[PDB]
Structure formats: C-alpha cells, structure tokens
Design a protein around this nucleic acid. Structure first.
Ligand SMILES: Nc1ccn([C@H]2C[C@H](O)[C@@H](COP(=O)(O)NP(=O)(O)OP(=O)(O)O)O2)c(=O)n1
Ligand SMILES: [Cl-]
Ligand SMILES: [Mg+2]
Ligand SMILES: [Mg+2]
Ligand code: NA
Length: 329
DNA sequence: CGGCGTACG
DNA sequence: CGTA
DNA sequence: GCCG
C-alpha cells in the first residue's frame, strides 16, 4: 500500500465503508477545530481503507498500512470489537459538532464564520434568519435555498442541465465545449452540485467567455444566484432545475480554461478533493514539480510542462494512470 | 522536529 | 472572508 | 495524527 492516495486506485464503492465513515467523522471534527494536520491524517487513513481489496476483520490487518497509528488503529479496533467507537459517537452527538456541521453546510459559510456564530451562542438556521443584518448576500441566498441545496443532485438531472448550459455557451462562443467534471465524472450517482468545465479548441478564444455565458443564463431566467448578477473564470451559482409541476434550486459550478490548460483543469476539477491535495503534495515533495489546475511547473528549469491529456500529466509525474472512477480517494 | 494544496471571487 |  |  503506497503512502500517497494518487499512487493507488480508489473506487467509489469498497469493502470498508463503515470504518472509513467513522474515521471521516473524526476528520471533519478536527477541521471544525482548525486542526488541519489531524484532519489530513484521518482522511488519509480512511482513504487507505477505501483502497483495500477486502474487508478489515482483524486489527493485525492494519499492520504496515500507512497513516494508521495508535489513534486510528484504536478507532478501528473498537468498531471491530463492539460495532461502535465511543469517541466517534461522542463527536456525533456533541452540540459543537452538530452545529458546526449545520452552519458550514450553508453556501457562503465556512469554518471561521460558523465558529464565530457558535461562540456568539447561535445554534439553528432560524437563529440566523432572525438576525439577517449580519449576513452577506451570498449567505442570504445560501440560507434561503438551504433546504433545496441539502437535497442530492441526481445523475439523471445532469444531462438536461448540461444541455441548457451548452445552449448558452454556444451562443456566447460558437465551438466552445462543456465537459462534466467533479464527482459525477468519477461515477457518483448523486452530488452536492454539478461541476462543468468550459473551453474552446482555439487557444485564446475563451478569454472573456464566462461573463457572456452567465449573462445568457441569467437572461433565460435560470440563475437564482450568482456573484455577478469585471473579468472572471469561475462561477459558483444557484440554478433553477425543473421538477414535476415545479422546480428546485441546485448548485452549479462553471469554470473556463484555455485549451492548453484543459488537461490540468480537468484533472483538478475531477477530484476527489483529497486525491488532488495528495497529487499536488506528491508532485512537489517527491518530484520537485509544482502542480495546480493551470499547469505543472519545473522550478529549476523555470518551465511549464505541456500536456495534451490527463494521461500526459500522470506520465510526467511518474505515476500509473488512474481513470476518474479510481480517483475516489 | 516541520510539514500538511493551491488556486480564484 | 468566501469558493473549487 | 502521522510520516519521513
Ligand atoms: N477544496 C477543494 C474543493 C474542490 N476541489 C476539486 C476536486 C473536487 O472533486 C472538484 C469539485 O469540487 P466539489 O464540487 O466541491 N466536490 P465533488 O464534485 O467531488 O463532490 P460533490 O460534493 O460536489 O458531490 O474540485 C479541490 O481540488 N479542492
Ligand atoms: Cl488551482
Ligand atoms: Mg461537485
Ligand atoms: Mg463544485
Ligand atoms: Na459552507
């Protein structure tokens, strides 16, 4: 078992679901306290179990696995012995965990904001609604739409949504393309949002595209919220999605990249989040190369690596290729 | 012990 | 600060 | 919390 998540296949469904879920509770709780290192270790340990070929049934099967030390091993031991880990259950039922989870789930609210509200004594969404002077426009939209946004987006919703985006993109710039990325490209059947990557085959033609796309979607009445409703290349919006007799709000992310950068953007936006952090960590720490969603930089030669495909990027990093379905770290 | 991803709005 |  |  290699130490970095980008060195091993991780399928969407696996053989240690309950164990990984428990470790991810502790990871999440660590993040709510600002303990990024502990969050990373618990996420990495959970991800190791996702990559195993069979269920862990005995503690000895953790020997030699990376990211399993005294703490994560004890969590697994208690789940194996008793079906429950007391530390995990104590986190689950704690007022702090429950409220931080509720607040950080709101679009426009991060850990720092949720923590400040928590320290001020706030506990429920209705607490926030009662004092709306203290909310940003983004947070007001996130709170108004929170119920719909807490409902999973279904893969069966995505194709109709992509067709609507494609129509607007084609008017904004004929020949521009829309690619489904994010969790759905990794095979997920549900998501918290839909992520779309937009480019154009002629380098430079994508300059200035996203404002034109957003204006056209807004003109069609489809945008319930966006930040520009001034150059930009990423948009985090709330979209009107049809439903029988009605509609529901859904989160949609749009990102534009020049075609020279498209493999890097596709890799980055396909995730998972942990896979990408691990890939960038591997690149820098093991290969001395700096990776982001725009490119891959050699800081000694002061040169960027041209990539025509995701396959190119894995090759330039000395990693076996993983299709998106195996990036579910 | 230091390090823990790296961007854009 | 928020967001991917 | 764990790795190197
Ligand atoms: N902090 C982050 C957030 C996202 N990302 C990348 C990898 C993610 O898969 C991709 C899309 O982000 P996302 O929409 O928040 N999550 P994802 O689509 O994987 O699953 P959902 O939660 O949307 O169902 O952006 C990242 O690299 N760092
Ligand atoms: Cl980036
Ligand atoms: Mg997504
Ligand atoms: Mg997204
Ligand atoms: Na949030």
């Amino acid at each position: 078992m290699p130490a970095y998540a980008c060195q091993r296949p991780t399928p969407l469904t696996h053989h240690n679901t309950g164990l990984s879920e428990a470790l991810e509770i502790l990871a999440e709780a660590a993040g709510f306290e600002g303990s990024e290192g502990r969050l990373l270790t618990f996420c990495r340990a959970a991800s190791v179990l996702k990559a195993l070929p069979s269920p862990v049934t005995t503690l000895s099967q953790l020997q030699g696995l990376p990211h399993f030390g005294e703490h994560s091993s004890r969590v697994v031991q208690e789940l194996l012995e008793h079906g429950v880990c007391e530390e995990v259950e104590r986190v689950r039922r704690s007022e702090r965990y429950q409220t931080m989870k509720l607040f950080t789930q709101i679009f426009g609210v991060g850990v720092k904001t949720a923590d400040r509200w928590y320290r001020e004594g706030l506990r429920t969404l209705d607490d926030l609604r009662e004092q709306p002077q203290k909310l940003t426009q983004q947070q007001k939209a996130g709170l108004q739409h929170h119920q719909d946004l807490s409902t999973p987006v279904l893969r069966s919703d995505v194709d109709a949504l992509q067709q609507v985006v494609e129509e607007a993109v084609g008017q904004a710039l004929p020949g521009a393309t829309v690619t489904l990325t994010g969790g759905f490209r990794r095979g997920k059947l549900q998501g918290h949002d839909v992520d779309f990557l937009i480019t154009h085959p002629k380098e430079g033609q994508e300059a200035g595209l996203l404002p034109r796309v957003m204006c056209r979607l807004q003109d069609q009445g489809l945008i319930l919220y966006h930040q520009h409703q001034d150059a930009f290349e990423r948009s985090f919006c709330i979209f009107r999605l049809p439903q029988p007799g009605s509609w529901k709000a859904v989160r949609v992310d749009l990102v534009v990249a020049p075609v020279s950068q498209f493999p890097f953007a596709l890799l980055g936006w396909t995730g998972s989040k942990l896979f990408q952090r691990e890939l960038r960590r591997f690149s820098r720490k093991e290969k001395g190369l700096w990776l982001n969603s725009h490119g891959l930089f050699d800081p000694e030669q002061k040169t960027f690596f041209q990539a025509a495909s995701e396959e190119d990027i894995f090759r330039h990093l000395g990693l076996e290729y993983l299709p998106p379905e195996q990036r579910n770290a």
